[PDB]
């Protein structure tokens, strides 16, 4: 595999998102770390699929709504940023006010 | 498209050109297999291999570097040898020369 | 005897005439020469050549090399050749034919009992990369860069502090001292840059005397004509380099005024295209000057479909800008220009831009300097074809021109080429071994000072080193004292003379920078073009000799999704 | 010109009169003062104030600070104020107005070329925490504590050995020597405690001469009147502190006998509530004495719905007790009392208990000292309202009273307040930067000796430091020699004089403890109450002046599920 | 008073007559002796025995031990006994009865204020293992081995280089010097092996003078009669050991010729069964000789259903062999033989093979030396029953015979038994504490030089050290200077005299090897059999005194799937 | 649990395979690291089940086909190797030319 430090680091993000994913499924209101991990992982898969940076900056704002997270959480996340390998290399996706 | 693929031009490579060679018939009289590497001083191989050791002095197998010739028990075969170059000084093996020649 | 060319390639690697594909790009290199005597190649293993009295001789340690890289395909600015590489005392001893003079002909690299062997048949070997635009935001950056194939890192910082987030500056004696001490803990060669933004020379001299090998002039600290002149005056007397990030706001003057302030003195211009910073919108015109050594940071390399979208936001968090403040955002469109971003790729292909760098965690990717440089070469080959300098049916020249961008040119620009930057005798043995299918992406072995410092390593408890999971892990060359012996901390001549190394009790080997004031654009290997370039103040169109310079954005790139898990 | 208060807060942080919510608690602080000159605030960035000739001057390094924290909201025992913080030579230089005297008014903290900048606008800055009840069970505890905001750790241990699992003691010269050496590898200031349980003074003197800054008297080694007297006699002559965990079994006497043995001599009582250990059921009555400096360990803080259930089991594995042995379990109900656990929270609110600590991995959570201290303040505000000392519509006094519990009071108790414990000039620059929404939970930056040692850090290969995943990673202040220069190893005066540092070849800076025998309850900042407290031997009810002291268990707490992944 | 045997075992561990099952194997040990005085056992904890004036005395540090392991069940080559273990100055002080002479009888190990305690009741304590076949392919191997219970590692390498992938050789002065420096960073005792394949003595002497404690003769470098004679001649004058991997190809002669070259001189034969390398197919006949110290590498131990299938491939990647080259593959069937693989297990049971080792990442598993040794003992008990030497209804003798294979015998073979290898007074305190259910699989505590270096550790932030997740983490004995004080770097006498330690500025304790030329098969503890063994050149059948020696392949083994997550 | 370094290291392999598993499910053509992780994890579970080394060396060649991975990937993986605890201890499984 020859995993570089950055690839291994992303495995940590992925696993954190698995945690959040199961909790959301149980019907729980997500907290701060769970929300960040869930949305971030969604963007990474988006890039793997070949979606554009422009598209993801938008789609990322419709992953979780204010009723799916704990009080104060939307305000604790003014934005979310994550990089991934798009077909045209690594790119940064910034999702502003992801939780409405 | 194959990542890192080679595009080797066809043909062959002549090995150890411009050097003396000789052919020797060798026979394994031992009861166990014996394999000889490309740069081993043929004259000092396992004593179980019977051949004209005198003719093989200062020679090694004329085979591509790193390969070898295997001699199963009782196996007889003719091999081609190529002379050592450089200082033509032999050290090691069975310790039969330990000096020039 | 005789052997077919294919079987030969499979056993000892390709030879004269054979071509090799670089990773999954469209670039093909062709072996220009082979220093071996056919049939006398050295190979290690059971029953192979490197054995007592055979390919290994009877010499004492002093008369043979410590390490030999057998059957390597060297790719360097000077040639693409097949040869054995000898390493002695942590430095390149010879490039030639290895073996035992006792029984083999033409041996120039003697192998004895004291010789370790690295089998490089089928692999490409290059010098270690050199990134001269490092923001020391976190120490983890060193491992990331080393893994990518970069062995020397020049830059400034004190850690995750606002000043460092934005500029490559290690402010003052105390922080410079502390970072030099911390440097002993990192597996890469290191040189620091001080804050050059001051109009009082003594404040700069103290920093140089403290240990920095250069001064960074950054607009966030005030890139004014006064500050620039001051920094250059000190640079000229202390033999250190000046890196520049000019006045984007055109607050103190336009590009012509900055150039006038420089007054023909030697200076390294960072991210010369401008997205990373600089006089909007024509800082790129600097590459036309003889005293300017121009480099690019990597996010704009190469021009792709997602480049622009991504930049508009990235340029906020770095320089501490407020999206709610009109003045902090209105200039974004003046700094991020499709016009200059597309031109930058061509300028590299022509040799007008001479260096590539990262701009680590401040609008740049530390582990992508090498990777992106090759993606540009690929994209340019695809769009423009063979270079005027090419000969034969290969991309050999384009390859030498681009590899020089992150190896020898950065070394020359910062006065460290006497120590690193290429595979030449006497230089530190900072080498990178690559499998052709992974060239420029994931190395097979990274050697520092003659000791492997990092490499992919499988299951530690396995019967062999290859079982999964295989990922990069630190080796002996990165451990304690062995690391100190295999890395260099670069100092200014004044610091070296003042006994700074002894004072701070630095444990690593020390090297001194020199020749920073005498290098010029003409000295950049294969990248010495001084184009008559202009930028339309309104359209932002770049022109060289009146012709429009531009390129098309890539939708897909090699060295990307086929190799990375994320 | 003029600017609205909201826009002002957004740009430079809150100012006089503005209130701020601490994390998700009900505690609100109000800026009591602002040391700036409106319009002359220093801000760093593109086109901002801190630039050559502007907010940055022409002075030499000796005449300006190495680091400046701009626009910080200081929360310390002495006040809650807005100001710039200057750091020079690894210590707090000044708290005031930063800038360039050449063009700005009232500048007390000069910024020059040698000055690094940390932007603290919108952030709260506090001194680093100090945990005086550390069991050195594993080295990993240091990173955990540093991440939470604790920069000094005092305790004892040799690793995961039975003696250490149960007591904070580093037994004898050899182990003391070994731990002092190991201490150089950790990014926190460290002081060790020896085993004080002996009735032969010389055995204790050797330990103090070896390097310990205190002696732990623990019942597991025999907390008898003879052992106690012996330890205190040595403490009085060598100027070191004694920490006590009394005789829970009432084997040698009751609490009054232990107090009698102490004989009015200065002593720090660990987990004074008793769940962590001590005379059942009235060890808590010790806080009434002038010579007793009382602290709490953190699992009982604050009283919640799950507290009791959890404790019955936790109290087994720590002290090597057998659940199958009646005598080893029957006393559990005598040690874990709802009555004293509920009272402890109120006693902290009144200032009767003066310190908070962990009791790391031996009935305590190393990363929760700060977090839990604030949860208690929240719970007390909710239950009891404003303190008699409060003024204004804020919780400013309650905040100063509680922050002192893990900063200045622990420092005073152990004789290290001349070096650390608060943000005052001359003290070591151990600072913690916090975003208000994460106050007391997850810091933005942890500074040790003037260098950032740990902070949240995003993707190393990213274009900026903010992309995910973001998690705490060691910075330059935690690397090799730089770490040695930014941390302190505390020694006893005898050890310092004996040349222990030179003998063991300790690389870190050395500090000597002093004033351990002269501190008393009256010296504890904002926590000097000596209540007339009693505990009913049968009901376990705690009373102060005859009134019953108690509180209700929390079902939900702030600084909990909203911030943690697990 | 009186106590039942079961309750006694539960409180203080088993006593004389009680039997204990080793992990999930069929092996049972029986306590042969107990050095305690019933009723006077020392136990630590609340209200327990080890307290001031009670089980702890009033002596000064010099008159008591630094560490005491209470109520341990010792399993060593000399006996299986119950006793307290005293450790002083990093070495084994005594094995006996601990306590306070003031009030207790028969105290031989005094406990005072300077004494730390490790509760070993219910645990088995053994010396640390010693692996003499290490390929230094990566530094991560040290932690893996330490976790398994191995505290000394002897071998050679420079990292992931072809020479090292195949042979245990650190080639020459420069690499030897670099590895000795790197060794200070690892938590295990270390000794290096040089490349012994040369026919010029001086080339070998330089390596010994540089610091190696032995020379590896490997066929990949040419295991010829000339090279062998040369290495042994140097070994005889410099008092260092020679490890041999003979000529598998029978290129220079058959096994009888190699034996003749050895000429009765002392030599350690690696992987004597032959799968790991050696004269095909009879290298195994070497164990019949008085001057040969024979060891096995671990992949063939013990013979299982999957052994053969797996080996055919493993033997390719190690020695750099080509599966496409007939000569490189045709011999696989001559090297991997079911006949000798089945016999090897019996030869160990009889004491003909005296050592077990790994052959780390070059046809061997670094973390499985101990584990596999016990699996063989289990399989032999199951197949052959009690040994002729057994007495009583236990496997005590078989246990002593097998534990010696990876402890005292390796120590004797390499001249380091004066320092390590067993639990005897004066030896370095390298000890391993085991829970009976996890014996030989996952240790409870690994002690190096008297300090715990690694152990399973739970949640760092937990109230106790036991909460999940529990996994091995480095302790204080593995940190910086403390580590240097608790580990040994072994040097040759010549290197020690030449001032090599001072020259390279080695920080760890130094030990010198001696007695490498005088050891012989008769000196191997419980494994001194010299069988009249023969191997049929055609069938490969192994015979001792004419009787066929063989065994059956296991389908399932203990110490496997019940303990490992993967 | 008392997880040794080798057990923890394998947790990384397992997680990498979870990534690939989900992507294959989405219908994507796997890249180099994803392919290696997916096949490797399959072998480890095979050993946990008690399958023989011989059986796995074969079965491992039928996990992914040339049409399920990106161009050039089969050529980048001449073989795959992984060790795991079989009922009879740790064994090495080598799968030659896993992707056909
Ligand atoms: Ni810039
Ligand atoms: Ni930059
Ligand atoms: Ni306690
Ligand atoms: Ni405690
Ligand atoms: Ni071998
Ligand atoms: Ni080996």
UniProtKB/Swiss-Prot annotation, chains A, F:
Q: What class of enzyme is it?
A: hydrolase
Quote one Gene Ontology molecular function term: urease activity
User: What does UniProt list under activity regulation?
Assistant: The apoenzyme can be activated in vitro in the presence of nickel ions and carbon dioxide, which promotes carbamylation of 'Lys-217' of the UreC (alpha) subunit.
Q: Which CDD domains match?
A: Urease_gamma
Q: Catalysed reaction per UniProt? A: urea + 2 H2O + H(+) = hydrogencarbonate + 2 NH4(+)
Q: pH dependence, per the record?
A: Optimum pH is 7.75.
Q: Which GO terms are recorded in the biological process aspect for this UniProt protein? A: urea catabolic process
For this UniProt record, give its keywords in alphabetical order, as a comma-separated list.
Cytoplasm, Hydrolase
Any matching Pfam family: Urease_gamma
As recorded in UniProt, its EC number(s) are: 3.5.1.5
Oligomeric and partner information: Heterotrimer of UreA (gamma), UreB (beta) and UreC (alpha) subunits. Three heterotrimers associate to form the active enzyme. The apoenzyme interacts with an accessory complex composed of UreD, UreF and UreG, which is required for the assembly of the nickel containing metallocenter of UreC. The UreE protein may also play a direct role as a metallochaperone in nickel transfer to the urease apoprotein.
| Record protein name field | Urease subunit gamma
- The source organism is Klebsiella aerogenes (Enterobacter aerogenes)
User: Coding gene?
Assistant: ureA
UniProtKB/Swiss-Prot annotation, chain B:
Report the pathway entry: Nitrogen metabolism; urea degradation; CO(2) and NH(3) from urea (urease route): step 1/1
Instruction: Supply the SUPFAM superfamilies for this chain.
Output: Urease, beta-subunit
- Signal sequence coordinates: none
Q: What class of enzyme is it?
A: hydrolase
Query: Can you tell which superkingdom this protein's organism belongs to?
Result: Bacteria
Regulation (activators, inhibitors): The apoenzyme can be activated in vitro in the presence of nickel ions and carbon dioxide, which promotes carboxylation of 'Lys-217' of the UreC (alpha) subunit.
> What does the annotation give as the result of altering residue 41 to A?
Reduces activity by 30% and reduces thermal stability above 50 degrees Celsius
Q: What is its EC number?
A: 3.5.1.5
Say yes or no: keyword RNA-binding present.
no
Q: Which InterPro entries match?
A: Urease_beta-like (IPR002019), Urease_betasu_sf (IPR036461), Urease_subunit (IPR050069)
Gene Ontology molecular function terms on file: urease activity
Among the record's GO biological process terms, what is one? urea catabolic process
Q: Where in the cell is it found?
A: Cytoplasm
Write out the entry's keywords from A to Z. Answer: Cytoplasm, Hydrolase
Cellular component terms (Gene Ontology): urease complex
**Effect of pH on activity:** Optimum pH is 7.75.
The record's comment on protein family reads: Belongs to the urease beta subunit family.
Record-linked HAMAP family? Urease_beta
How this chain assembles, per its entry, is:
Heterotrimer of UreA (gamma), UreB (beta) and UreC (alpha) subunits. Three heterotrimers associate to form the active enzyme. The apoenzyme interacts with an accessory complex composed of UreD, UreF and UreG, which is required for the assembly of the nickel containing metallocenter of UreC. The UreE protein may also play a direct role as a metallochaperone in nickel transfer to the urease apoprotein.
Protein name per its UniProtKB record = Urease subunit beta
Which organism's genome codes for this protein? Klebsiella aerogenes (Enterobacter aerogenes)
Curated annotation (Swiss-Prot), chains C, D, E:
A GO CC term? cytoplasm
Reactions performed catalytically: urea + 2 H2O + H(+) = hydrogencarbonate + 2 NH4(+)
| Cofactor field | Ni cation
Q: How is the cofactor bound, as the UniProt entry phrases it?
A: Binds 2 nickel ions per subunit.
Q: What are the Urease domain coordinates in residue numbering?
A: 128-566
Enumerate the active-site residues.
319
Q: What is its main location?
A: cytoplasm
Q: How is its activity regulated?
A: The apoenzyme can be activated in vitro in the presence of nickel ions and carbon dioxide, which promotes carboxylation of Lys-216.
How is it modified post-translationally?
Answer: Carboxylation allows a single lysine to coordinate two nickel ions.
Keyword presence, Chaperone: no
The EC designation for this entry is 3.5.1.5
Q: Which processes are annotated in GO (biological process)?
A: urea catabolic process
UniProt key word Transferase: no
Give me the residues that bind Ni(2+) 2, please: 216, 245, 271
Activity-pH behavior: Optimum pH is 7.75.
The entry's stated outcome for residue 218 to A is: Reduces activity 500-fold and increases KM 1000-fold. Resistant to inactivation by diethylpyrocarbonate and iodoacetamide
Protein name, entry field: Urease subunit alpha
- UniProt organism field: Klebsiella aerogenes (Enterobacter aerogenes)
According to the entry, what is the taxonomic lineage of the organism? Bacteria, Pseudomonadati, Pseudomonadota, Gammaproteobacteria, Enterobacterales
């Amino acid at each position: 595999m020859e995993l570089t430090p950055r690839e291994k680091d992303k495995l940590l993000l992925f696993t954190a998102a698995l945690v959040a994913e199961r909790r959301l499924a149980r019907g729980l209101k997500l907290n701060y770390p769970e929300s960040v991990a869930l949305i971030s992982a969604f963007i990474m898969e988006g890039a793997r699929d070949g979606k554009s940076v422009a598209s993801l900056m938008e789609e990322g704002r419709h992953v979780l709504t204010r009723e799916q997270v704990m009080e104060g959480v939307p305000e604790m996340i003014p934005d979310i940023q994550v990089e991934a390998t798009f077909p045209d290399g690594s790119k940064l996706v910034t999702v502003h006010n992801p939780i409405i | 498209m194959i990542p890192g693929e080679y595009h080797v031009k066809p043909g062959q490579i002549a090995l150890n050109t411009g050097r003396a060679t000789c052919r020797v018939v060798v026979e394994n009289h031992g009861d166990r297999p014996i394999q000889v590497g490309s740069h081993y001083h043929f004259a000092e191989v396992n004593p179980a291999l019977k051949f004209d050791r005198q003719q093989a002095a200062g020679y090694r197998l004329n085979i591509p570097a790193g390969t070898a010739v295997r001699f199963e028990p009782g196996q007889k075969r003719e091999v081609e040898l190529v002379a050592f170059a450089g200082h033509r000084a032999v050290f090691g093996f069975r310790g039969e020369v330990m000096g020039p020649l | 005897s005789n052997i077919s060319r294919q079987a030969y390639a499979d056993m000892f690697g390709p030879t004269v005439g054979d071509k090799v594909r670089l990773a999954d790009t469209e670039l093909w290199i062709e072996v220009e020469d082979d220093l071996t005597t056919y049939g006398e190649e050295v190979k290690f293993g059971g029953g192979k050549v490197i054995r007592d009295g055979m390919g290994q001789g009877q010499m004492l340690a002093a008369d043979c090399v410590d390490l030999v890289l057998t059957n390597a395909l060297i790719v360097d600015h000077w040639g693409i050749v097949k040869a054995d590489i000898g390493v002695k005392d942590g430095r390149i001893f010879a490039i030639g034919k290895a073996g035992n003079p006792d029984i083999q002909p033409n041996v120039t690299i003697p192998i004895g009992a004291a010789t370790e062997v690295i089998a490089a048949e089928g692999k490409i070997v290059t010098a270690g990369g050199i990134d001269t635009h490092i923001h020391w935001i976190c120490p983890q950056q060193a491992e990331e860069a080393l893994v990518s194939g970069v062995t020397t890192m020049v830059g400034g910082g004190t850690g995750p502090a606002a000043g460092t987030h934005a500029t490559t500056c290690t402010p003052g004696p105390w922080y410079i001292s502390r970072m030099l001490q911390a440097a002993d803990s990192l597996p890469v060669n290191i040189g620091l840059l001080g804050k050059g933004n001051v109009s009082q020379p003594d404040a700069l001299r103290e920093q140089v005397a403290a240990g920095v090998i250069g001064l960074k002039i950054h607009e966030d600290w005030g890139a004014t004509p006064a500050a620039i002149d001051c920094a250059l005056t000190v640079a000229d007397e202390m033999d250190i380099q000046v890196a520049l990030h000019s006045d984007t706001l055109n607050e103190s003057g336009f590009v012509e005024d900055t150039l006038a302030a420089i007054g023909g003195r030697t200076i390294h211009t960072f991210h010369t295209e401008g997205a990373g910073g600089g006089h909007a919108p024509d800082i790129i015109t600097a590459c036309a000057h003889p005293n300017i050594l121009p480099s690019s940071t990597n996010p704009t390399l190469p021009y792709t479909l997602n480049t622009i979208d991504e930049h508009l936001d990235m340029l906020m968090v770095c320089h501490h800008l407020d999206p709610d403040i009109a003045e902090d955002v209105a200039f974004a469109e003046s700094r991020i220009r499709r016009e200059t971003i597309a031109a930058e790729d061509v300028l590299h292909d022509l040799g007008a831009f001479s260096l590539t760098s990262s701009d680590s965690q401040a609008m740049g990717r530390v582990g992508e300097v090498i990777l992106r440089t090759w993606q540009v070469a690929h994209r340019m080959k695809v769009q423009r074809g063979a270079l005027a300098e090419e000969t034969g049916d290969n991309d050999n020249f384009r390859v030498k021109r681009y590899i020089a961008k992150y190896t020898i040119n950065p070394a020359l620009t910062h006065g460290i080429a006497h120590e690193v930057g290429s595979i030449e005798v006497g230089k530190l043995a900072d080498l990178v071994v690559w499998s052709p299918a992974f060239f420029g992406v994931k190395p097979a072995t990274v050697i520092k000072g003659g000791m492997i410092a990092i490499a992919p390593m499988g299951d530690i408890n396995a019967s062999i080193p290859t079982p999964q999971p295989v990922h990069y892990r630190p080796m002996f060359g990165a451990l304690g004292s062995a690391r100190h012996h295999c890395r260099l901390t670069f100092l200014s001549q004044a610091a070296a003379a003042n006994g700074v190394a002894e004072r701070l009790n630095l444990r690593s080997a020390i090297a001194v920078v020199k020749g920073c004031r005498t290098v010029q654009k003409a000295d950049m290997v294969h990248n010495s073009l001084q184009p008559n370039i202009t930028v339309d103040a309104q359209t932002y169109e770049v022109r060289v000799d009146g012709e429009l310079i531009t390129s098309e954005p890539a939708d897909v790139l090699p060295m990307a999704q086929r190799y990375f898990l994320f």
